[PDB]
Design a protein around this ligand. Structure first.
Ligand SMILES: O=C(O)/C=C/c1ccc(NC(=O)C2(NC(=O)c3ccc4c(C5CCCCC5)c5n(c4c3)CC(=O)Nc3ccccc3-5)CCCC2)cc1
Ligand SMILES: CNC(=O)c1c(-c2ccc(F)cc2)oc2ccc(-c3cccc(C(=O)NC(C)(C)C)c3)cc12
Length: 545
C-alpha cells in the first residue's frame, strides 16, 4: 500500500528556518508503495524478541499520572481545553480524557483523526521541512495510560544493551568503547534508512503490537493497545491546521507515543535478521529509533564490503532501504551516528577520557536563532547538557548564555529544552550537578583536545562570523568572576563550568547536591514525538545546600 495519499489540500502553518512552503517537496519524497519480503532469519529474531518481551509486566497509568506527564506547551485539544487544563486536572479535560478512554475500549475499528504539520527547524541547497503527524491531546493522554509503562520498560528487556535510549552520554561512550575493544579486529558502520517512517508497513506495526501483547497487561490496557494499533498506529486520515482533509497515512505517525519505541524495535528486528543473512561475525548493535550502528569482527577489506552489500540487500527486502550506502570503518572515531562521533581528551591527571562530539555548525546556528528570537523550547541548553565535555559547548555555548542570563537576572528561571526526542524543564543553576551525573566530574577538567576537533571548531567560528576562541576565554573570565560573587549554585556554575578559563585551574571536588538528583525518568526510554514532560526533582535536600 501507499505510505501516504494526498487530497491536494495544503499542509497549512499553525541561517534559515524550514517553513510550510517546502512541505510539498517532503510529500513527494515520503510517498511510495512498499515492498516487503520476510524470511526465516526475520521470523527467528522476532520469536527471540517475543520470548524476552514475555518477562515484562506493565501497569496501567491513572488519568492523573498521564495528565502530569503532559508538557505545558503540548498542542491544545480541538475539544476546548489545553495542556494547562490537563496538568491542573480540570474537570473538562479529565471528563473528555475518560470519554476518549471509554471509546478506545468500545470501538475497535474507527480510524482516529490526526493533524499533519510542517516542522520549523533551523539549518545553516536548503532542505525541505519535516512532517509531524499527531492525534488530539485527549488521545495522547490515553496513549500514556495504556503504553507509557510498556514503552519505558519493554525495549530494554527485549534489546538489552542494544537499546540506545537507556544511556547517559557517559554510559553510551563506555558501551561503544568496550564493544570496540572486545573485538580482535573491529569493523563498524552506521546504517541510514531512507524515510524510515514511510518504510514502516502495516504488518511491521502489527508485529510491534504482537511484541507489546507478550507483556502481563491489565485487560483495559490490552484492549486500548489493540484499538490504538488498528485505529491509530497502522494508519488513518490526515487533517491540516485549518481542519481540511489532507489525505491518508498507512505508515508510522511521527507524533505518537510509540514512535520511538516502535521504530527502535522494528529497526533492531530487521537489522539483527540482516546481520544473520550477511553472516556478520560477533555483532554488537546499538539502536536509537531508525539510527543504527553495528560493531563486528572484520573478515578483511573485500569481505567487509561484500558483507555490507549483503546486509543492505536483506534490509531492502525487509522494507528498510538505505539513504546513503553503509561504509565500513576501522577506527571507532570515524563512525558518525545521530550526527555524533567519539573523540578523546585528557582529564586533570592526564588520563584518557572518551566523549561524544559533533560538527558545531547547526547547534551554533540554532543558538544564534534562539538568542535573536524568543523560543518556548530551546536547543542551546539541550546542546550544553548533551555536549558539556566538548570544546565548543564549554567555550562558546556556556560563555554566551551565562553572560545573557547574568544580564537578564534569569539564572534561577527554569527553561524548556529539547534534547533529541524529549522535553526537559531545567534550571540553568543545576547544570553543574546535571553534567557531573551525565558525564562525570572530568567534564569540567578536559584538555588536550584533538587537532581535528580544535580545527573543526576554529573553522566553524570563522565560517559563521563568530569571534575566535581567545575572545571566548576573556568573556568567560568575566562571566566566572560575576558568578563566583553570587555564591551558592551560581558560584558553583562559575567554579565548575568555567575552570577551563583560568590560568591556574582549581582542584574540583564532587558537588554534594549532585547525589540527590532523580534522573531515572531521563535516560530510561526514547520519547521522540511521544509528548513526554521531564521536570528535574531532588530527593532529600540537605539544609546547608
Ligand atoms: O580577533 C580578535 O582579537 C577579536 C575579534 C572579534 C570578532 C568579533 C567580535 N564580535 C562582537 O563583539 C559582536 N558579536 C559577538 O560577540 C558574537 C557572539 C556570538 C555569536 C554567534 C552565536 C554563537 C553561539 C551562541 C549564539 C550566538 C554568532 N555570531 C556571534 C557574534 C555571529 C553572528 O552575528 N551570527 C551568528 C549566526 C550563526 C551562527 C552563529 C552566530 C558583539 C558586538 C559586535 C559584534 C568580537 C571580537
Ligand atoms: C546508534 N547511535 C547512537 O546511539 C549514538 C551515537 C553514536 C553511536 C556510535 C558511534 F560510533 C558514534 C555515535 O552518538 C549519539 C549521540 C547522542 C545520542 C542520544 C540519543 C538520545 C538521547 C541522548 C541523551 O544523551 N539524552 C540526555 C540524557 C537527555 C542528554 C543521546 C545517541 C547517539
Amino acid at each position: 500500500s501507499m505510505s501516504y495519499t494526498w487530497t491536494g489540500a495544503l499542509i497549512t502553518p499553525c541561517v534559515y528556518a524550514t517553513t510550510s512552503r517546502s512541505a510539498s517537496l517532503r510529500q513527494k519524497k515520503v510517498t511510495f508503495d512498499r515492498l516487503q519480503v520476510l524470511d526465516d532469519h526475520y521470523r527467528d529474531v522476532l520469536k527471540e524478541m517475543k520470548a524476552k518481551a514475555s518477562t515484562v509486566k506493565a501497569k496501567l497509568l491513572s488519568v492523573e499520572e498521564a495528565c502530569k506527564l503532559t508538557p505545558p506547551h503540548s498542542a491544545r485539544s480541538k475539544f476546548g481545553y489545553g495542556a494547562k487544563d490537563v496538568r491542573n486536572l480540570s474537570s473538562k479535560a479529565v471528563n473528555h480524557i475518560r470519554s476518549v478512554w471509554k471509546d478506545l475500549l468500545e470501538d475497535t475499528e474507527t480510524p482516529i483523526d490526526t493533524t499533519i504539520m510542517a516542522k520549523n527547524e533551523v539549518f545553516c541547497g536548503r532542505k525541505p521541512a519535516r512532517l509531524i503527524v499527531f492525534p488530539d491531546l485527549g488521545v495522547r493522554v490515553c496513549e500514556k495510560m495504556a503504553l507509557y509503562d510498556v514503552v519505558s520498560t519493554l525495549p530494554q528487556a527485549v534489546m538489552g544493551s542494544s537499546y540506545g535510549f537507556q544511556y547517559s552520554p557517559g554510559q553510551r561512550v563506555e558501551f561503544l568503547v568496550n564493544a570496540w575493544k572486545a573485538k580482535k579486529c573491529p569493523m563498524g558502520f552506521a546504517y541510514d534508512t531512507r524515510c524510515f517512517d514511510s518504510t514502516v508497513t502495516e504488518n511491521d506495526i502489527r508485529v510491534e503490537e504482537s511484541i507489546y501483547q507478550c507483556c502481563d497487561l491489565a485487560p483495559e490496557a490490552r484492549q486500548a493497545i489493540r484499538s490504538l494499533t488498528e485505529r491509530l498506529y497502522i494508519g488513518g486520515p490526515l487533517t491540516n491546521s485549518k481542519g481540511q482533509n489532507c489525505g491518508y497515512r498507512r505508515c508510522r505517525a511521527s507524533g505518537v507515543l510509540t514512535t520511538s519505541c516502535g521504530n527502535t524495535l522494528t529497526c533492531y528486528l530487521k537489522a539483527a535478521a540482516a546481520c544473520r543473512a550477511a553472516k556478520l561475525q560477533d555483532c554488537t548493535m546499538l539502536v536509537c529509533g531508525d539510527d543504527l550502528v553495528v560493531i563486528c569482527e572484520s573478515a578483511g577489506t573485500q569481505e567487509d564490503e561484500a558483507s555490507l552489500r549483503a546486509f543492505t540487500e536483506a534490509m531492502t527486502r525487509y522494507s528498510a532501504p538505505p539513504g546513503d550506502p553503509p561504509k565500513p570503518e576501522y577506527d571507532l572515531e570515524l563512525i558518525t551516528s545521530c550526527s555524533s562521533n567519539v573523540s578523546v581528551a585528557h582529564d586533570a591527571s592526564g588520563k584518557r577520557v572518551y566523549y561524544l562530539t559533533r560538527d558545531p555548525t547547526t547547534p551554533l546556528a540554532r543558538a544564534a536563532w534562539e538568542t535573536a528570537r524568543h523560543t518556548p523550547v530551546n536547543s542551546w541548553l539541550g546542546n550544553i547538557i548533551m555536549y558539556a565535555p566538548t570544546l565548543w559547548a564549554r567555550m562558546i555555548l556556556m560563555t554566551h548564555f551565562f553572560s545573557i542570563l547574568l544580564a537578564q537576572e534569569q539564572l534561577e528561571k527554569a527553561l524548556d529544552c529539547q534534547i533529541y526526542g524529549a522535553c526537559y524543564s531545567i534550571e540553568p543553576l543545576d547544570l553543574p550537578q546535571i553534567i557531573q551525573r551525565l558525564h562525570g566530574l572530568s567534564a569540567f577538567s578536559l584538555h588536550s583536545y584533538s587537532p581535528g576537533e580544535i580545527n573543526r571548531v576554529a573553522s566553524c567560528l570563522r565560517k559563521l562570523g563568530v569571534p575566535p576562541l581567545r575572545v571566548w576565554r576573556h568573556r568567560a573570565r568575566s562571566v566566572r568572576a560575576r558568578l563566583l560573587s553570587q555564591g551558592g549554585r551560581a558560584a558553583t556554575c562559575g567554579k565548575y563550568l568555567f575552570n577551563w578559563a583560568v590560568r591556574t585551574k582549581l582542584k574540583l571536588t564532587p558537588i554534594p547536591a549532585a547525589s540527590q538528583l532523580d534522573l531515572s525518568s531521563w535516560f530510561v526510554a526514547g520519547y521522540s514525538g511521544g509528548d513526554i514532560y521531564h521536570s528535574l526533582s531532588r530527593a532529600r535536600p540537605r539544609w546547608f545546600m
